[PDB]
């Protein structure tokens, strides 16, 4: 029934009929949105450029955030270990048991957070997550355990840790708005009510949830050297190296060596902020004008899925003004900011007709605007050009990480919405990477740096973490700066 | 972010918590529920006895309606071919170029019908599609073809006929209401309206979409034996040979003999109408009476994804009735028919919290209904049992054309929404037919029968039927009962 169960061929999109003016039009297009091999080659040198600045001493745009993980996941890991992810809208527990073969079993529960939990009292935020781990704890531990359960906590808030069992919060986003807990450590403040309700766990570490989709792949596939979000928001984490990191000079214990591992949360999503390199095109600068924190997160704005309907919008409403197209048409929805969400690019790249007869009915159904077949094919290049673009920028981050490092292989643990969903974005990544590198390869199985599927960084990373932080802080190897 | 990319493993699933009275109502829904192989083996009987009395001159409740495709592609077959596939909805055109090796290429356009369409005129409504099709050839062939294109036409409307390139419409359904068109032949209305536009297409096959997902999926894959659609429609399509169906004795030419295969489209879903083996229970019967043609399609509703819902909402409202069950809620919107869509016991059996949060956010956002987690773990159960007995009875279809023609071994190739999006629904098949035939076997992919995914039958299937019948054309092999 409808087209079949296998992905449909890919449409052949002829041009042949598309009149000269579009057809100029669509050449424009492609001039502001392709990016060139050579123009990824340039950015990714100043990426790794800005990779090292910031782990200087004076810093730089790209936090490059030591993560105090300090050694690999070997795979052999084996025990019962807690996570927590405090999202914006719930809370989620995870029991994880290392098998000792890169392989894991988990338990889960997922505790869906008040509405007014994210604007109340600190007690009441920690009383309420350590009700959950006693609920939790009670039900799967019905008789104790002998050792505490180590738990590491994925905390993704703007925060400085000086060691990896602390999290000084910096300020609140994703719609928390708690009073007296920015500039305070929540490790301290979750563990005294856990304590309170006397629950056998000891909160061990505090990671952002990217350092743990690093580690979490790391341990089930050791070929992984980078973890990689790329969906509403973006970011990566590797492992550097001691010696690389000069704003730790002065402040690390002896027994973590100058050659030691150090897992990097680069949040990178404010790399290119003084606007040097990225392509931003008109439309990149209105949408950054018009967004929440203009100039502020520069990278993240030109990859980030979130804003790729809203180029569109903008590109069409310029050809709209400009004469091109819709010329009868009722343009009224078009003005709306955001109206096209990601849903519009995905699904205009998704369509397998040559004329494109999902997207005429999704700017028919949604948009009230109808349209013609060549301006339908001029539509579907935009989608295309939009996506080819995010993955291409992506890509940079990920050159630049391994060729900083000296990767001439990788495997690059992805997830994020853009990743998991978006049409075509594991080709148009490949493509990308191949481009840059221009490897004599056929198949994208055979990438010498490749994307794969990552492991749950939030919950299963976030215990592999507290698993690896536990034997360090029984053996009394450090975990953080001198003294802290 | 979430839980990774990776499906979750399955839950625990303890039930450690629920009380007496409630695992005793869960072993009663066991009860209702469960259906063992011995049941299957039961049922299958049956329904090979049902195949053999619908190709019987006294016929039955399964239809088994000769399509009228006597041979099997080879995978050899070469040239162009177009199909056309008329819904309720929508016209899909489809241009099929076969390479001779089982392998293909398409190039398809889609045409939302107007609105006017549905209760227009019968030229209106051929008027239309010769109109799409003459845009479409005149596109892709911009300086004609040598030879007319052959067009195999889905019809998606219960018909008859005598030969495979003639469709008698019986009965229109869709809210069609055209008027002219019962009663006689379409293939000379769109051939008319064709000629009048002087297209060069000759229309040489009408089929139902199960038989074209049998033939392109043979076409493609060696190894099918059958054409499966699980949706919200059941149907199925496989051949047989000419000697085993006594209704076309005396019927057929010499050239359409008794070791002749014939394609038989089953139309099965009305299996069973007379209510002598599947296994109703209270619920099923509660469902039948209220549907629109109570006492029809017995088959389909005990294996199509569209009740699933709905026995779930009835289950559920018993055991409140009972006092059992949500005990202190306001049970209104539980009362309202089919507001259990699939998704219900879809998202219950995908969830993967042992606290069911899930399915707790879909009963709380969308019903208005608060659960205890006990509660959610019988909820679950319950998802789990229906899911599970509507793909053991679909595989019972399976097994008796298998049974029937002596398939030791087989690819099924199926399509629909069950089997494409239902959780777990592969698994559940696979284990059913490892059930019925107590194979010693330890994974599905090694199943002697197997269900994989079918290729499009309503565009591509058509497409080939159009190449085997115009061979057979060509070459004056009858297609048909002698005369017509």
């Known amino acids: 029934v409808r087209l079949g169960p296998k992905k449909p061929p890919a449409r052949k999109g002829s041009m042949a009929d598309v009149p000269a003016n579009l057809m100029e039009q669509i050449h424009g297009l492609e001039t502001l949105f392709t990016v060139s091999s050579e123009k990824m080659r340039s950015i990714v040198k100043h990426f790794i450029s800005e990779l090292d600045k910031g782990l200087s001493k004076k810093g730089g ?3 490059m955030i030591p993560g105090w993980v300090v050694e690999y996941p070997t795979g052999k890991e084996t025990g019962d270990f807690l996570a927590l992810d405090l999202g914006g809208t719930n809370l989620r527990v995870v029991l994880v048991k290392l098998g000792g073969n890169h392989d894991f079993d988990t338990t889960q529960n997922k505790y869906r957070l008040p509405d007014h939990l994210r604007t109340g009292t600190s007690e009441q935020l920690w009383s309420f997550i350590a ?8 039900e799967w531990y019905p008789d104790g355990v002998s050792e505490p359960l180590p738990l590491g906590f994925t905390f993704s808030y703007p925060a400085s840790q000086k060691k990896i069992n602390s999290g000084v919060l910096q300020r609140w986003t994703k719609g928390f708005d708690i009073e007296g807990v920015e500039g305070h450590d929540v490790v301290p403040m979750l563990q ?6 006397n629950i056998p766990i000891n909160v061990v570490a505090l990671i952002n949830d990217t350092t743990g989709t690093l580690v979490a792949s790391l341990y089930t596939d050791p070929q992984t050297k980078m973890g990689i979000i790329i969906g509403t928001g973006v970011n990566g984490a590797y492992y550097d190296v001691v010696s690389g990191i000069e704003k730790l000079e002065g402040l690390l214990p002896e027994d973590i060596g100058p050659d030691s591992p150090m897992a990097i949360n680069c949040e990178y999503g404010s790399f290119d902020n003084e606007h040097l390199v990225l392509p931003r095109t008109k439309y990149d600068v209105i949408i950054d004008e018009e967004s929440p924190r203009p100039g502020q997160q520069a990278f993240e704005k030109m990859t980030s899925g979130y804003y790729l309907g809203e180029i569109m919008r903008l590109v069409l409403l310029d050809l709209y003004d400009s004469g091109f197209i819709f010329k009868d048409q009722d343009i009224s929805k078009l003005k709306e900011a955001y109206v096209m969400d990601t849903s519009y690019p995905s699904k205009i790249e998704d369509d397998p007709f040559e004329n494109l007869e999902d997207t005429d009915d999704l700017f028919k159904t949604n948009l009230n605007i ?13 989608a295309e050009l939009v996506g080819t673009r995010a993955a291409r920028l992506t890509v940079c981050g990920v050159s630049a990480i391994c060729d900083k490092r000296g990767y001439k292989t990788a495997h690059i643990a992805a997830d994020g919405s853009v990743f998991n969903r978006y049409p075509g974005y594991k080709e148009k990544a490949a493509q990308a990477l191949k481009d840059i590198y221009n490897w004599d390869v056929e198949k994208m199985e055979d990438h010498p740096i490749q994307l794969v599927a990552a492991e749950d960084g939030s919950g299963v990373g976030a215990a592999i973490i507290a698993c690896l932080t536990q034997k360090r802080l029984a053996a009394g190897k450090s975990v953080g700066i001198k003294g802290e």
């Open 61 to 63: 745009n790209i936090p």
């Open 131 to 138: 009700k959950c781990l006693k609920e939790f704890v009670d």
């Open 192 to 197: 005294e009510q856990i304590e309170k309700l």
């Open 370 to 382: 109808e349209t013609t077949v060549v301006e339908r094919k001029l539509i579907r290049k935009l």
